[PDB]
């Protein structure tokens, strides 16, 4: 079962700084060991194999060593296109085995975030519903405080939020919330707003609207 | 070149078995084994087992070694895996890879549940003349109430690529998964491009295709 142990879980460093992962077995393997790159989507794509050797196409930035039972992969020159999951793999011992896999996000300066609404279209208001949605664009880091605000007053387990994976051009994250309410209480109330409490303003910033039509 | 294109996402009852299939080409099918590896969301990756396409003999992970099988077709090159007494715990997405993992599949994403299919409907997030401003200006579609997943969404038929960003689907109380798909793009072109997105749930055979225009 030869357990690959992977560290960290999740690491993080800056365009031009270097990535170091480990992968330690469980018992001796020897030199059939593997490392894959899955960037978001996609399926995984093979980088190293045979401890150190890279894969044709693989640029020489991405380094495998070690031997043994610890191993390592390296990246010399982090860049935007490298953002992705890896996987350390072992192939000496049946079955295959897998490590837990590293997150590679990246540091950069703040941005404010660009806060966009939406009203509900008159598409689904007909089907008995009203979904708004507040869109915060290209922004860093991801921590960021949604707070939906109807008529002067907060809402609450009323709404959803999904947040992008790291872009891979502009290192910024991007986030959606949407307030999901009825039909109904969306044709009473006039003031649908949208606060956003990011580590990169003073106060908080807020668009909002009121159902024109 | 080498590909190996795989089933679609499909949905199947808790208790029921399915066969996934991996159409190979672009090389000699019968000289590489081939692989079939399971992820599951957000966890790990777990390698299956092998077969060898050639005689027909077959290594199994001593874990889905009951659970699954794996089986070939000689002359339309393609390998079968077939799951058993699925449950909850079996949904994930499938890989079908050439032997030294060089080459993987697009994978296949099985969605174990007593629910049933449900085709997303789809209303557009109008740019807003108004409240998406600073040059450019934001549109996309809002993909609501659809089971299970996945559900893809491309823009312009694929013509368009570029400020698009699709968020991962939410899973709503419902039970139902929801998603959205906006994209960026200059302010100046909201009288003049018409924008489409074209939405894609295999899992009920559902294509729809929705025009954003500036609301008014
Ligand atoms: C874990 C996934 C994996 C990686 C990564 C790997 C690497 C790799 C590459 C990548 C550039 C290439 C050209 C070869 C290239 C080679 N590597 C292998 C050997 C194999 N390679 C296999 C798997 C495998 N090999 C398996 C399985 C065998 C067979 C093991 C055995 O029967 O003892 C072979 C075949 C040897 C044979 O047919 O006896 C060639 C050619 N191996």
């Known amino acids: 079962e030869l357990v690959m142990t992977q560290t960290p879980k999740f690491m993080s460093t800056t365009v031009g700084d270097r990535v170091s992962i480990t992968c330690k077995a469980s018992?001796?393997?020897?030199?059939?060991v593997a490392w894959y790159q899955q960037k978001p989507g996609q399926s995984p794509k093979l980088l190293i194999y045979?401890?150190?050797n890279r894969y044709t196409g693989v640029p020489d930035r991405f380094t495998g060593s070690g031997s043994g039972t610890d191993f390592t992969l390296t990246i010399s020159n982090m860049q935007s296109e490298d953002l992705a999951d890896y996987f350390c793999?072992?192939?000496?011992?049946?079955?295959?085995?897998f490590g837990g896999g590293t997150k590679v996000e990246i540091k950069r300066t703040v941005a404010a975030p660009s806060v966009f609404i939406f009203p509900p279209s008159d598409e689904q208001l007909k089907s008995g519903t009203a979904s708004v949605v507040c869109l915060l664009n290209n922004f860093y880091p991801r921590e960021a405080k949604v707070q939906w605000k109807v008529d002067n007053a907060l809402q609450s387990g009323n709404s959803q939020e999904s947040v992008t994976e790291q872009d891979s051009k502009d290192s910024t994250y991007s986030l959606s919330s949407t307030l999901t309410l009825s039909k109904a209480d969306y044709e009473k109330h006039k003031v649908y707003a949208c606060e956003v409490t990011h580590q990169g303003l003073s106060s908080p910033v807020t668009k909002s609207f009121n159902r024109n039509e | 070149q080498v590909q190996l294109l795989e089933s679609g996402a499909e949905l199947v009852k808790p208790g029921a078995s399915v066969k996934l299939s991996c159409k190979a080409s672009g090389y000699t099918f019968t000289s590489y084994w081939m692989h079939w590896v399971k992820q599951r969301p957000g966890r790990g990756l777990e390698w299956i087992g092998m077969?060898?396409?050639?005689?027909?003999?077959?290594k199994y992970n001593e874990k889905f070694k009951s659970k699954a099988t794996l089986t070939v077709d000689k002359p339309s090159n393609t390998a079968y895996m077939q799951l058993s007494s699925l449950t909850s715990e079996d949904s994930a997405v499938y890989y079908c890879?050439?032997?030294?993992?060089?080459?993987w599949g697009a994978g296949t994403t099985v969605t174990v549940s007593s629910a049933s299919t449900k085709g997303p409907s789809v209303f557009p997030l109008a740019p807003s003349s108004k409240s998406t401003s600073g040059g450019t200006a934001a549109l996309g579609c809002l993909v609501k109430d659809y089971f299970p997943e996945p559900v893809t969404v491309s823009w312009n038929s694929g013509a368009l690529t570029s400020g698009v960003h699709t968020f991962p689907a939410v899973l709503q109380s419902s039970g139902l998964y929801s998603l959205s798909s906006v994209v960026t793009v200059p302010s100046s072109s909201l009288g003049t491009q018409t924008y489409i997105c074209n939405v894609n749930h295999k899992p009920s055979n559902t294509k729809v295709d929705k025009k954003i225009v500036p609301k008014s």
């Open positions: 018992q001796n393997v020897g030199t059939p």
């Open positions: 793999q072992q192939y000496s011992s049946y079955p295959l085995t």
């Open positions: 890879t050439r032997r030294d993992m060089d080459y």
């Open positions: 045979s401890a150190s």
């Open positions: 077969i060898d396409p050639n005689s027909g003999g077959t």
